[PDB]
Amino acid sequence: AALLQCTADTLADAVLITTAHAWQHQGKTLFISRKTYRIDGSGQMAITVDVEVASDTPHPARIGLNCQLAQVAERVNWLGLGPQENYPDRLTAACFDRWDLPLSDMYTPYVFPSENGLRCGTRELNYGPHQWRGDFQFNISRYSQQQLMETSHRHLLHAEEGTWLNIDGFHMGIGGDDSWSPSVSAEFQLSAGRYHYQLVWCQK
Amino acid sequence: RRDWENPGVTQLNRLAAHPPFASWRNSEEARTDRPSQQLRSLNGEWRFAWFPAPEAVPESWLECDLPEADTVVVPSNWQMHGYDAPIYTNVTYPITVNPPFVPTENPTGCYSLTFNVDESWLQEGQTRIIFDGVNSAFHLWCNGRWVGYGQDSRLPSEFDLSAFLRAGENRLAVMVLRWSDGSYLEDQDMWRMSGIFRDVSLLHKPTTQISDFHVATRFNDDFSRAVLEAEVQMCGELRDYLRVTVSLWQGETQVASGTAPFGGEIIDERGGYADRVTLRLNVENPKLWSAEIPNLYRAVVELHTADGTLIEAEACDVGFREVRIENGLLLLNGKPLLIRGVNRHEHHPLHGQVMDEQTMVQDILLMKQNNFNAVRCSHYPNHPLWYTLCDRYGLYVVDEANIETHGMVPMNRLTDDPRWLPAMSERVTRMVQRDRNHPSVIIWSLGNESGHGANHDALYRWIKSVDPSRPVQYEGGGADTTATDIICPMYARVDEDQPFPAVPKWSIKKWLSLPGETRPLILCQYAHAMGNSLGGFAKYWQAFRQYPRLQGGFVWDWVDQSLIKYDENGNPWSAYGGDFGDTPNDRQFCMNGLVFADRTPHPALTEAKHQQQFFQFRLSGQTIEVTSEYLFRHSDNELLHWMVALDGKPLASGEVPLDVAPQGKQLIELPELPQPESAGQLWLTVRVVQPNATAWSEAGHISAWQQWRLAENLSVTLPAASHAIPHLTTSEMDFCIELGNKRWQFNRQSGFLSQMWIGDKKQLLTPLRDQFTRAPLDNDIGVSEATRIDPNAWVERWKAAGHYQAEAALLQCTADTLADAVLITTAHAWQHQGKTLFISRKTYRIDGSGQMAITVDVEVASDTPHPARIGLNCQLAQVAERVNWLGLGPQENYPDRLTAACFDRWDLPLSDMYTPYVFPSENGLRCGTRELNYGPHQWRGDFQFNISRYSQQQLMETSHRHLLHAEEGTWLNIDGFHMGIGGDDSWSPSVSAEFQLSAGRYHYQLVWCQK
Ligand SMILES: O=[N+]([O-])c1ccccc1O[C@@H]1O[C@H](CO)[C@H](O)[C@H](O)[C@H]1O
Ligand SMILES: O=[N+]([O-])c1ccccc1O[C@@H]1O[C@H](CO)[C@H](O)[C@H](O)[C@H]1O
Ligand SMILES: [Mg+2]
Ligand SMILES: [Mg+2]
């Protein structure tokens, strides 16, 4: 990430932070992320994200944010699709409701580890004293993407400190027509060029 | 006798049907197709009188001209001269349904002509008159004596006048009935007119003559050898000294010839046809005919004495081609066709249904220039010259019997009735007898929209017996009945099934594989081009290319059937159904053409040209792969032009010759290309250009194009810190912002930007407000009418949900001062009767540079009908001469109809940004736009827009383009999102799901600045 801009303004009832970053590689700009954070008297933090994706770079796996929360909580409660893991091109069986599961059920123990446990169509997500509202997809577990991508057998994974939270405005389909040739359908690739998403983080 | 109320009497004294004759008396003139002294035209000035019923015609008229008659031009349709009104009705018959009777009030056209006959025509042989087209039934007298009668408005009626004429002056009297029992078989969706609307001619034939001739061409397995077989029949004085010689010419060279005496092979226990002869000519390496290369030979049929006297000669253009269906595919000369077709009615906005060569040529040129290779004669045999033109210019033709009984209930009531077989039979058999030697005709059709009756099965079989060289198709009764060799539906969708009972319209892809089905599928009508339409067209072409058995279709249709009317000031205007007092009528349903009545293109034409290209392209790196979809020709009149530009700025370009064999591929690797690091999108555009002119196109004609986004450099450059900060001033009613010479005013009660000044000049006539509706397109309305609402049509769903009447309720409006800008924030709710339909949340940020960034986030209730658009609108104070944009163009383009548009920098006169569809609706959008310039303003973002002198309100409230009036200022509509326009049909919602605005939440952003 390269910073392009970071500013702070005070509004009548809130503080507004504005940021812009470019992601580049071998001098090419791959992605540009523009955001605003607006914190008001209610203590809610509203995040708006607008992303540009160069038309000539391969369509990305996802467009979201991530962080390692310091807290580890027993349950996960969300208003969205579930209860089991679901992805864009594999979510017909999931139902929209309010689900509540132990954190470990939010991780799928695929023998060969990878991105896993996403839930889509989520309007509200609760974990510990935090609450996220918006229209996103998410996964939450003790394992970072880095670890999963560096690990070849589930038995070698180890819980990291805290909880890794991945909250996506958009996520690419997973495909599966076969496992030896790209099989994610066009309608499930993130090829729009410009993406917008917004979330509200607040304390519960 | 009221012969016009008896389907059992379709003619009296009419001569047999046959292919075009000219009775040349010199074979070289027959070979060259020059005029024949034996074939005269009687077209010109005639005498005409209109009567309200045949009972009102005075008997004196048979013997002499009526003083009150007018002199008028023939051919003509009398409605075109104002004698009575033409009627525009689609399905419902224009008369009370009570076969076989017609109204006692039945407009009768009394035509007459005094003309001369040279004595020599009466000294020997036979003199006949030919009426190529009389609508709908007529009696004929010559010199006051009754000659005969005829029905079928679309084929020639010929009568022998030999015994009625006298040397010098003669007078014809033709009493034409507008309505007859023939009318029950003429219910096509078009203007209902009448008159002697095709040519009238007089033909002299010798007593011993060629009465019919049929030409067939059969081939060997690889088409390198053929046998031309010509069966010739004679009438007259049959003697042993008679011969027929058939010679075949390629230009001035005679390639083959055969001569034989009369007497065909034995055919049964009673012998053979002593009055017939079959000549068989061997032809090596014949030049084959196709729409791609319309190679023709000339066959001359000489009837002569063995000792050398030519009695008469007849002749035709011959196209060596074989048409056959094998293994589920329609093949032409052994290769599977891909039909780029269109249905074409015979229509002229001034002359009605009268055709002329200029207009036909004009239509053929434009069809070919727009990549069409086929035409269906919807829904009757055409004027004879059409065929000649298609043979010569090269178009595949579906020749269709003049049988349409749509208005019956059920639709096969007459076609399944044996009492209507004779009348139907004549319409089929006489067509085949007239047009069977034209190579352009490749498929026969039994008529249209007449259900499926036993009569179709009998006639299907008759054709198959008499002419095995061409398949037979017929869509009625479900499009895949036993009366059709090709599954030929109308308006079946690509992927969406429409399972109506009895006659379902399956997705075309699904249709082909139904259990036991094996026939090819070619749509007899697809993509209803009514008003702003053709949305989804590309979907059809992708399917046709992917599925071998999906071999194309005929677009509905070529030209709008609008008629010209003149206002108080004598200025012409385009009229449609009901504009002549005609009622009931089907209003604008008569305009469904790719082109306007005067042949000006509608924007959809370019979409069709593009999807119907004959060269396919793929890009890999700097390598372009060109694939030919021609079946028979090499790319011998083609070159590839290529050009690379960055945001409209040309960086490099070139040309490469195209040398691809039919169905072949060519790889072209482009030169080291530009790799600028300046921000923007790099686009490659390629065009196939025909350097040499052809019979149907000018040198430099573009036949194909395609574009690809090459590299993109996103802008990362920070803008320069401003030497200013805008000031905010507040009052209870407004937020005013000022910066330099610019000012912005936001109304606190309405919550919208109400005014902007550049200098001292106001820029807006109406405030900037959200807009979720559009002036409805013909496809949005479908069949809905005030008197009979169709609740399922998009327009009605929007209306009923309150979209057009919703009022913006302000929920919030604040202004804040930032470090280097002023920020206005607003939120509005649109409700209707208690229902919140949409919520619009925006920010407007005006900075020290004077630009205004507007961010819009809209929520749309999931249970309200998907809205037509999500955008902003305002009436600008300025009227500027031009419009310049960086986006798709240059023509109007909508989300489901934009493949033909190209991304570039375009610049046009304001008026070209409006499309003058006869029935006004939303129009002129351009999509994929990144920057728009108009007068002093510039808008940047990623949006679609339209800009013109007409508000959406006016367009939706006006029914005819000539009644629109330019408003003050310019109406600008800038949409973040716009719904598809549809068009698979114009009577059932046809916007594909992927083009409906059903996301629920939408975001868009624009920067408006001045320059
Ligand atoms: O046959 N119909 O009852 C009918 C009702 C409403 C709309 C179209 C329609 O039929 C359709 O009309 C279009 C009009 O351009 C064409 O004539 C097409 O051939 C016909 O099937
Ligand atoms: O046929 N039309 O072109 C047409 C235009 C506007 C309204 C009704 C209409 O045709 C009418 O359509 C209804 C179906 O909705 C029936 O098929 C009716 O028989 C037909 O005349
Ligand atoms: Mg009759
Ligand atoms: Mg000779």
Ligand SMILES: [Mg+2]
């Ligand atoms: Mg003589």
Ligand SMILES: [Mg+2]
């Ligand atoms: Mg019809």
Ligand SMILES: [Mg+2]
């Ligand atoms: Mg009507």
Ligand SMILES: [Mg+2]
């Ligand atoms: Mg394209």
Ligand code: NA
């Ligand atoms: Na892994």
Ligand code: NA
């Ligand atoms: Na095909």
Ligand code: NA
């Ligand atoms: Na029509």
Ligand code: NA
């Ligand atoms: Na060439």
Ligand code: NA
């Ligand atoms: Na209108």
